[PDB]
Amino acid sequence: AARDLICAQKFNGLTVLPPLLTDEMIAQYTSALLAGTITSGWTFGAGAALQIPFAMQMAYRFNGIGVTQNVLYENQKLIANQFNSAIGKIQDSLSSTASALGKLQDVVNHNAQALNTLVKQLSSKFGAISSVLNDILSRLDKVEAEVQIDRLITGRLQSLQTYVTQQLIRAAEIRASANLAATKMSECVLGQSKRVDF
Amino acid sequence: STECSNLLLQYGSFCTQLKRALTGIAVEQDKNTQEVFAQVKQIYKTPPIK
Amino acid sequence: MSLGAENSVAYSNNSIAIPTNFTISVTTEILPVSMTKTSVDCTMYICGDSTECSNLLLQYGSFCTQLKRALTGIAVEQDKNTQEVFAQVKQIYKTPPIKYFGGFNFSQILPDPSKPSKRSFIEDLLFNKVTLADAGFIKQYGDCLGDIAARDLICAQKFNGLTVLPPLLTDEMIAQYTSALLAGTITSGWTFGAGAALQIPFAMQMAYRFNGIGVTQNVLYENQKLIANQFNSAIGKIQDSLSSTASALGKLQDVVNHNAQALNTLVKQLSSKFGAISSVLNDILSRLDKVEAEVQIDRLITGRLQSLQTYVTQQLIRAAEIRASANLAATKMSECVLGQSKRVDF
Amino acid sequence: TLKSFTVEKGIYQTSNFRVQPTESIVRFPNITNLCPFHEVFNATTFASVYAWNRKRISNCVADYSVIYNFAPFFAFKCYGVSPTKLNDLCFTNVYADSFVIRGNEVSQIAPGQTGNIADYNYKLPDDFTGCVIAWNSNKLDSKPSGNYNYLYRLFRKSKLKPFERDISTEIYQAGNKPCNGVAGPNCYSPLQSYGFRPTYGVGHQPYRVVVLSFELLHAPATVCGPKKSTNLVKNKCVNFNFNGLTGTGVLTESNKKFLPFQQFGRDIADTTDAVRDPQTLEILDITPCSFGGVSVITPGTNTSNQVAVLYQGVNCTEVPVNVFQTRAGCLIGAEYVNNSYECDIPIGAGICASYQTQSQSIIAYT
Amino acid sequence: RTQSYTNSFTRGVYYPDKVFRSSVLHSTQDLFLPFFSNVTWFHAIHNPALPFNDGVYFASTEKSNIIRGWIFGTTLDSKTQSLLIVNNATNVVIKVCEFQFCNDPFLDVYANNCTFEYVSQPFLMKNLREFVFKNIDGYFKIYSKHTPINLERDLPQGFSALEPLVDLPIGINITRFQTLLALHAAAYYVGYLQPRTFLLKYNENGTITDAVDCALDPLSETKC
């Protein structure tokens, strides 16, 4: 059919490397965290995993927020039904509206447009007579082609340094967000948080 | 193009720095994923009774 | 790659598991706080006491004024980071000479008066393991003037306009702050971090700590010698791991290595031509007339200014990372040392 | 340096102090001969282009101001150097290449040209440093009947490498049938004649071309221009001129073990660290004279106009362009007291400065 | 004459410039002899011309001092100034004079125009000797080194950098070369230079001690 954007990125020296952990490994880690949370509580994050029935663990969670644990045991089916209804509401909202995941889509789109701009910067003349090195090397002699090629080299080097600098700043933002995600994994999933709005 | 390579050799080690910066970013991404998700020492699994 | 051992906990709807013993664990967390403060002179780096190069360097505006301003801001920020992390106690508390704390043995972390810099044994191991670049915080121009053996990288940095500024707090001031924090923690508990230091025996403070994690305080008093022995064994294992394993302190070594490598790259960039006929400025000035040498000098000036700009931008990004790590270290100093934290894995 | 008439309390990096050079030293080889440029630029007959004559010039003193007197040209067209700076610095060897071409091919005597002369007769290298001198010779190298004494080669199997010569005359063949020494069908003699006439146009006149090829200094210099030497002093910041390269620094006796073919020593930043003196075979270390940073410690101008100056990183028995010695440098203008206060103006490794009554003065403390 | 083959064994390194460097790793690009190459051993008791292709490495392990000089050119039977080198107990005169010599260049121990007549110290004094010839931009460069080899079996290991001796100011179209003999036998090695990139190592005395050929194996490219 037609030439792809990824092929034109690949042919100009721009390469995308795969991550070390595959998606199946991330799913294995997520399932292990979920199974340890359901079958042990918070005990698997502070040592060995000690089993506890889920109603008794949930009574511990109610005791942690200042409600006596007879409130759970006398309203167990209502709380289970409310949890199931909220999980079904999350299912309906995820199958209906797709505007909630704009952060990861923005992460994808920024990396797409940066490489697209870096490819498109190869068409600029930067004050030379052409953007093609073969046309410059065929039309002119050695000194004039050296001058035009030096102008193109300076422009392409400047655009590549701009790309690397904005990638470093974006990587700093991504590392801050990943540090927050690691803290929320340690404190919301592996324990119960007393911090307000955390 | 060989002439462009010989003229680019006169600019020092700008591209070594760019390669080093991109390699550091690439290693840092895998470190981010490992520090978020590999917080568990053993792979627990749920019993078949749900 | 393996993600870990497979486990399957025995879940039932009427089965529980309750521990009958415990262990006392001492672990080590290492956090960078500051980095090396540097200053760069543009007029000597780019030109090197050439009048013609300086006259054509004044045509480029105030690029070096803002490069100097950025480096000065980084230099003040490093001292601010150290001040926020370490200068958290108001008074320099001293430990009483009777060093009995219920059987807990703090000799490896409390200082000794034998050596001049009153550091502990573990601090001595940590300072010996992290090798330094021995940069220009100690003066070396008298040593750089005398040509001995072979020319060093630091003398080549110094002779090209790159300088290292010493930190405001010396190492014995940091050791004094750390010793005051240890004395306040051991003799008072967490009361010194919220007001006046109120003394309490160490066994009763540890019973308060046991009450803080949901264990009844008679468990301490019926198992005091076992917990003291476990703490002493864990401190000895920290000693043995620090004497044996050398890869634990890689973060501070990386902080040293990046700052050494950036200055080495900045020195090595002076050998490039950037399209001119020579990287040597006097050869350009002697071989050529006024206008052609002005063109070649402009090429060299543009290249060296670009390399200096790249160095300053990378230093600003690294300073942001170091400031984030120092903020984390100050939070951990406030919440772990001066209190008891309920946050999981903090 | 702040672009303001009022400054606030603090420490400010103002400028850098540099020790100025006192004397000047010129070190040139002791050579008294004169270079034979008159026998190059003033000859009765020059050789042909395919058989160009190379003359080696060495062990003499070259003056380039007589080149204009010897020959009537316009442009002293140089590539790696300039005409006005040839008498100051100097080289290892100079070569002179002499031939006579037409006016069309003068532009082909240049680095990076192709054509007839530049591809089959005389090719210059890409890194050529030297001067090309060309002038008209219609009254010497022309005849009314046609001058056939100058030959050019226009047929060859391959292009000519730089600074090569071809003198062999063989019958060129451009076909499958061999010539076998017979100039018949598809056989041509590569040497053709210019045929100079005074009635030709301005682009077809003979041009006498002299190519001066300088080589940069790698071997100890045999040709150097007119410049009187100067006696050598040591342990002082001076201006030196060692065989054409200038600089400013302090020359000391060196313990470096040069091999006998080596004349210099470079640093990591590509700067001449050590030099060999051309008069006496001695090795000298070059180091720059004393410098550093200067920081001015002041309170506000609302408070006082008194200042203290910190000379950064130096050990000030070497200060000039109370006195207390710190580890950040040494402090001039502040008196060190044996008291401890809170830090007001941070100086260095545990040392601060403040403005205290106990008349008002600037004190320094830990 | 009899031919054999021997490994090069990291030999054939020369100083690329006359600049003193100490305690530094330097990267150069020049016509070098690649590491662990396939050099040819010649046993001379018997001779077509050996081709000169982008420079020639030369070596000799002879204690009896028989091999003496070379001729560099294309035809070597007069008609062109080629080269002449004679190294006896007297001076070491390098000549460009043609001679119209025989096809078996033997020396007896019982011409035309001339340009170069250089006279210097004796080149020839467990006396392994090294030679590198090169023809770049009309310049003929000659490097040399002597090494006291202990066990005379093949080319030894280790390093011995080659120092420049004579730079002839002219030379055009060197395509073949030949050697000589001396009678009242000879054994020399010939290696071929290739445009390789090397990483040189200087000690504190300014002597080249180690080197890395950047295009030998991927470990050396990682080191470079």
Ligand SMILES: *[C@@H]1O[C@H](CO)[C@@H](O)[C@H](O)[C@H]1NC(C)=O
């Ligand atoms: C409790 O577990 C047993 C064994 O799996 C099961 O038979 C029983 O149904 C469970 N209790 C309830 C209320 O489902």
Ligand SMILES: *[C@@H]1O[C@H](CO)[C@@H](O)[C@H](O)[C@H]1NC(C)=O
């Ligand atoms: C433990 O304390 C004793 C004094 O009670 C002391 O002698 C010993 O050195 C301490 N242990 C270590 C490992 O320093």
Ligand SMILES: *[C@@H]1O[C@H](CO)[C@@H](O)[C@H](O)[C@H]1NC(C)=O
């Ligand atoms: C140059 O001077 C040196 C030492 O001063 C001396 O050995 C040499 O003979 C002199 N050369 C000439 C040509 O005078």
Ligand SMILES: *[C@@H]1O[C@H](CO)[C@@H](O)[C@H](O)[C@H]1NC(C)=O
């Ligand atoms: C060239 O040399 C001849 C013979 O020495 C002389 O007559 C003539 O004047 C010289 N030309 C110039 C321009 O000096």
Ligand SMILES: *[C@@H]1O[C@H](CO)[C@@H](O)[C@H](O)[C@H]1NC(C)=O
């Ligand atoms: C350099 O400073 C130190 C620090 O006081 C001093 O002991 C030494 O004598 C100084 N060196 C000189 C003056 O040469």
Ligand SMILES: *[C@@H]1O[C@H](CO)[C@@H](O)[C@H](O)[C@H]1NC(C)=O
């Ligand atoms: C060198 O080349 C010859 C030519 O055939 C070959 O026989 C010999 O094995 C080679 N030497 C090696 C590969 O070590």
Ligand SMILES: *[C@@H]1O[C@H](CO)[C@@H](O)[C@H](O)[C@H]1NC(C)=O
């Ligand atoms: C440099 O030379 C000195 C003096 O002979 C010698 O002691 C030293 O070992 C040498 N260094 C080497 C061979 O690395």
